[PDB]
Structure formats: structure tokens, C-alpha cells
Design an enzyme around this catalytic site. Sequence first.
Site, PDB file in Angstrom:
ATOM      1  N   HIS A 198     -23.906  45.235  40.516  1.00  0.00           N
ATOM      2  CA  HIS A 198     -23.882  44.145  39.541  1.00  0.00           C
ATOM      3  C   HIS A 198     -23.692  44.730  38.148  1.00  0.00           C
ATOM      4  O   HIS A 198     -24.248  45.785  37.833  1.00  0.00           O
ATOM      5  CB  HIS A 198     -25.225  43.399  39.563  1.00  0.00           C
ATOM      6  CG  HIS A 198     -25.556  42.794  40.890  1.00  0.00           C
ATOM      7  ND1 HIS A 198     -25.090  41.578  41.298  1.00  0.00           N
ATOM      8  CD2 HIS A 198     -26.296  43.276  41.927  1.00  0.00           C
ATOM      9  CE1 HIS A 198     -25.564  41.333  42.528  1.00  0.00           C
ATOM     10  NE2 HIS A 198     -26.312  42.343  42.940  1.00  0.00           N
TER      11      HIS A 198
ATOM     12  N   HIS B 173     -23.746  47.381  47.093  1.00  0.00           N
ATOM     13  CA  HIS B 173     -22.904  46.651  46.123  1.00  0.00           C
ATOM     14  C   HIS B 173     -23.487  46.877  44.738  1.00  0.00           C
ATOM     15  O   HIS B 173     -24.510  47.525  44.558  1.00  0.00           O
ATOM     16  CB  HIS B 173     -22.746  45.193  46.474  1.00  0.00           C
ATOM     17  CG  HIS B 173     -24.025  44.443  46.435  1.00  0.00           C
ATOM     18  ND1 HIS B 173     -24.806  44.242  47.534  1.00  0.00           N
ATOM     19  CD2 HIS B 173     -24.725  43.924  45.407  1.00  0.00           C
ATOM     20  CE1 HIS B 173     -25.924  43.582  47.159  1.00  0.00           C
ATOM     21  NE2 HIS B 173     -25.906  43.372  45.874  1.00  0.00           N
TER      22      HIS B 173
ATOM     23  N   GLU C  71     -29.758  43.413  36.750  1.00  0.00           N
ATOM     24  CA  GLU C  71     -30.450  42.246  37.228  1.00  0.00           C
ATOM     25  C   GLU C  71     -31.924  42.262  36.882  1.00  0.00           C
ATOM     26  O   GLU C  71     -32.432  41.347  36.218  1.00  0.00           O
ATOM     27  CB  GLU C  71     -30.167  42.071  38.713  1.00  0.00           C
ATOM     28  CG  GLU C  71     -28.744  41.589  38.893  1.00  0.00           C
ATOM     29  CD  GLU C  71     -28.451  40.822  40.139  1.00  0.00           C
ATOM     30  OE1 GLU C  71     -29.137  41.018  41.144  1.00  0.00           O
ATOM     31  OE2 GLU C  71     -27.548  39.950  40.050  1.00  0.00           O
TER      32      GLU C  71
ATOM     33  N   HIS D 147     -17.445  38.730  44.827  1.00  0.00           N
ATOM     34  CA  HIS D 147     -18.675  38.737  44.067  1.00  0.00           C
ATOM     35  C   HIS D 147     -19.113  40.109  43.631  1.00  0.00           C
ATOM     36  O   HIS D 147     -19.964  40.236  42.754  1.00  0.00           O
ATOM     37  CB  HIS D 147     -19.781  38.080  44.889  1.00  0.00           C
ATOM     38  CG  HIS D 147     -19.361  36.795  45.519  1.00  0.00           C
ATOM     39  ND1 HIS D 147     -18.968  35.688  44.873  1.00  0.00           N
ATOM     40  CD2 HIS D 147     -19.310  36.498  46.852  1.00  0.00           C
ATOM     41  CE1 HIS D 147     -18.708  34.725  45.775  1.00  0.00           C
ATOM     42  NE2 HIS D 147     -18.892  35.203  46.948  1.00  0.00           N
TER      43      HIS D 147
ATOM     44  N   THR E  86     -30.172  38.038  45.517  1.00  0.00           N
ATOM     45  CA  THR E  86     -29.855  37.598  44.164  1.00  0.00           C
ATOM     46  C   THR E  86     -28.536  36.865  44.091  1.00  0.00           C
ATOM     47  O   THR E  86     -28.082  36.530  42.980  1.00  0.00           O
ATOM     48  CB  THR E  86     -29.928  38.683  43.117  1.00  0.00           C
ATOM     49  OG1 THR E  86     -28.809  39.552  43.249  1.00  0.00           O
ATOM     50  CG2 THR E  86     -31.214  39.448  43.203  1.00  0.00           C
TER      51      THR E  86
ATOM     52  N   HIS F  86     -27.419  47.829  44.366  1.00  0.00           N
ATOM     53  CA  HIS F  86     -28.312  47.350  45.416  1.00  0.00           C
ATOM     54  C   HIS F  86     -27.943  47.956  46.733  1.00  0.00           C
ATOM     55  O   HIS F  86     -26.761  47.944  47.116  1.00  0.00           O
ATOM     56  CB  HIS F  86     -28.259  45.825  45.505  1.00  0.00           C
ATOM     57  CG  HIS F  86     -28.899  45.175  44.307  1.00  0.00           C
ATOM     58  ND1 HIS F  86     -28.680  43.845  43.957  1.00  0.00           N
ATOM     59  CD2 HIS F  86     -29.746  45.697  43.413  1.00  0.00           C
ATOM     60  CE1 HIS F  86     -29.397  43.602  42.859  1.00  0.00           C
ATOM     61  NE2 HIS F  86     -30.050  44.702  42.518  1.00  0.00           N
TER      62      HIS F  86
HETATM   63  N1  LIG Z   1     -23.495  41.277  56.253  1.00  0.00           N
HETATM   64  S1  LIG Z   1     -23.510  39.749  55.552  1.00  0.00           S
HETATM   65  O1  LIG Z   1     -22.158  39.323  55.156  1.00  0.00           O
HETATM   66  O2  LIG Z   1     -24.226  38.657  56.387  1.00  0.00           O
HETATM   67  C1  LIG Z   1     -24.482  40.104  54.092  1.00  0.00           C
HETATM   68  C2  LIG Z   1     -24.882  41.481  53.801  1.00  0.00           C
HETATM   69  F1  LIG Z   1     -24.507  42.534  54.558  1.00  0.00           F
HETATM   70  C3  LIG Z   1     -25.599  41.701  52.638  1.00  0.00           C
HETATM   71  F2  LIG Z   1     -26.005  42.882  52.313  1.00  0.00           F
HETATM   72  C4  LIG Z   1     -26.047  40.618  51.832  1.00  0.00           C
HETATM   73  S2  LIG Z   1     -26.962  40.969  50.385  1.00  0.00           S
HETATM   74  C5  LIG Z   1     -26.442  40.032  49.047  1.00  0.00           C
HETATM   75  C6  LIG Z   1     -24.917  39.908  49.082  1.00  0.00           C
HETATM   76  O3  LIG Z   1     -24.257  40.961  48.711  1.00  0.00           O
HETATM   77  C7  LIG Z   1     -25.646  39.314  52.095  1.00  0.00           C
HETATM   78  F3  LIG Z   1     -26.057  38.320  51.252  1.00  0.00           F
HETATM   79  C8  LIG Z   1     -24.891  39.060  53.224  1.00  0.00           C
HETATM   80  N2  LIG Z   1     -24.525  37.724  53.526  1.00  0.00           N
HETATM   81  C9  LIG Z   1     -25.475  36.619  53.673  1.00  0.00           C
HETATM   82  C10 LIG Z   1     -24.553  35.496  54.296  1.00  0.00           C
HETATM   83  C11 LIG Z   1     -25.054  34.090  54.614  1.00  0.00           C
HETATM   84  C12 LIG Z   1     -25.418  34.265  56.078  1.00  0.00           C
HETATM   85  C13 LIG Z   1     -26.879  34.478  56.518  1.00  0.00           C
HETATM   86  C14 LIG Z   1     -27.582  35.758  56.100  1.00  0.00           C
HETATM   87  C15 LIG Z   1     -27.749  36.058  54.604  1.00  0.00           C
HETATM   88  C16 LIG Z   1     -26.825  37.135  54.222  1.00  0.00           C
HETATM   89 ZN   LIG Z   2     -27.343  42.518  44.741  1.00  0.00          ZN
END
Ligand SMILES: NS(=O)(=O)c1c(F)c(F)c(SCCO)c(F)c1NC1CCCCCCC1
Ligand SMILES: [Zn+2]
Length: 263
Positions: free
Chosen positions: A98, A96, A108, A66, A201, A121
Site C-alpha cells: 500500500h 502486497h 496504513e 488494487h 484492509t 502486508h
Molecule cells: N487468495 S484470495 O484472492 O482469496 C485473497 C488473498 F490471497 C489475500 F491475501 C487477501 S488479503 C487482502 C487483499 O489483498 C484477500 F483479501 C484475498 N481475497 C479475499 C476475496 C473474497 C473471498 C473470500 C475470502 C477473503 C479474501
Molecule cells: Zn493490505
Amino acid sequence: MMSRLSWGYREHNGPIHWKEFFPIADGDQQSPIEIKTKEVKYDSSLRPLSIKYDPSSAKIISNSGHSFNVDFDDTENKSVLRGGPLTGSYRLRQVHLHWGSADDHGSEHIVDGVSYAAELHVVHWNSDKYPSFVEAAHEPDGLAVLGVFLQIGEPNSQLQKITDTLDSIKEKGKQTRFTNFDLLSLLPPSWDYWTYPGSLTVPPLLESVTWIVLKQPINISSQQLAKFRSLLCTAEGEAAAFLVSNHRPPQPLKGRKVRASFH
Ligand SMILES: NS(=O)(=O)c1c(F)c(F)c(SCCO)c(F)c1NC1CCCCCCC1
Ligand SMILES: [Zn+2]
């Protein structure tokens, strides 16, 4: 096709389809947003922003399918975001980016109708209250995210460390060691910002984010930006597809108001 585990940015699994499996997509505190500056108020109660970043906190860069993700050692408080709208210390977790399929749009957030080419972000989580990122992401005060716009301009030397890795992480799931990363120097000189309560997002689109969107863009060249579009959204042994665009459109404010750090 669209499914809980196979969301993306392609025709059948893209943003307009995320609500099929994540109905919070149509919630009241979704991100990104359009910022209408004539309706933004300066808030003198915002405290100075504090950004303490240690280059050794970075550990790994990977292709999530992604975006790229730079993951940080979030065990200590060496890299933390404080101040501004925030109560307590928010620990750096992830960076990351976008972009869109062409240079004219891809950010975004959109400010008074203006899009940028891309948007970085920088994700942090409230370690003063919550035991893990994963838990913080489910609380309204859990996450704090800096948004930095990238405008087409003269190439940005600060992006080299990232761009040098992209061939090594072409396929989804690949990773490579990535430390000693000067994140601080990918922020613009002015840290004036807008802030509002919003969401991740990407799915699962959780409404846990205090957004801090910086006004001043940093530069990226078209040649640099194009390298990101050569990442794949597909894993080794899966029919290849390119991650040419990975931005969610703005969602309605639905009563939220946006505050400015500056006047
Ligand atoms: N470390 S992680 O894989 O949990 C994770 C980040 F580090 C992030 F910074 C983020 S931010 C948006 C994605 O890039 C993230 F969504 C997730 N993943 C989501 C996964 C679904 C699980 C529950 C928590 C929401 C974060
Ligand atoms: Zn983002």
C-alpha cells in the site's frame, strides 16, 4: 461508481464509500489503526516469532487492480509464520503493498501520528484448522498478517525483483511467473512488533486477522516508490486510471488494546 464489485480508491468508490456495500467497515475490529504507544503494554507471554520462508514458494505476481499481489504455493508448509501471538502454523499466501499519492504519507498503520510512505502486508492463514485461505479468512483466528513500514531512504535492492515486473503487469489482471523470491530479506533487521486483532484492509474487510506490525521500517527511494503508482486500476480495454494511492485510513480502536513484543 461504488458497488460491491467495483470498490477502489477513487472518489466515488474509495474507502469512505466501502460501508455502502460492506457495513463491517464500521465494525469493532477494523484495520488499520493508530498505535498510541503510551497505551501499549509489553506482553511477556508472547513467544518468539518464527519465520521460515522458502524462496521457491513464490509462484506468480499479478495486478489485482488494487495492488500487486505475489501469490505463494500454500500447499505445503515450506513458508510459515509461527510464534508470537499465534497458536499453530500460519501458511504464507500473499504479499502486497500500500502507498499514497505522495511520499509523505501512504502507510496504513500510523504510529503516534507518524506515517510512512508505504506499507507491505504479508498474509498467512491457519492451515492447522482450516482447509483453505478462503475459509480461514472468515474465522477470527484464521489469518496472520505482518505489516512492514517503508520509509523514504536509500534505494532498497531487495525490491528489484518486484519493480522489474511492474511494466509486465501494468493492467489489471495481468500476471507473470515470479519464483525464487527472497521475501525474508525484505523484512527489517529487528522484528519487534505490535499485535492486535483486526481485519482485512480491503473489502470484504473481514475481521479475521491477527496483525503483527513491525516497528522498524525498511527503506524505499522515491524513484522506486513512484513506479508502483504507474500500475493501473483498470483492465486492458477499460479507460485507463492509475493506482496512485491504495491505502485505507486508520479506523478506531473501539476498545481493543494493542500489545508490544518488546520493552
Ligand atoms: N487468495 S484470495 O484472492 O482469496 C485473497 C488473498 F490471497 C489475500 F491475501 C487477501 S488479503 C487482502 C487483499 O489483498 C484477500 F483479501 C484475498 N481475497 C479475499 C476475496 C473474497 C473471498 C473470500 C475470502 C477473503 C479474501
Ligand atoms: Zn493490505
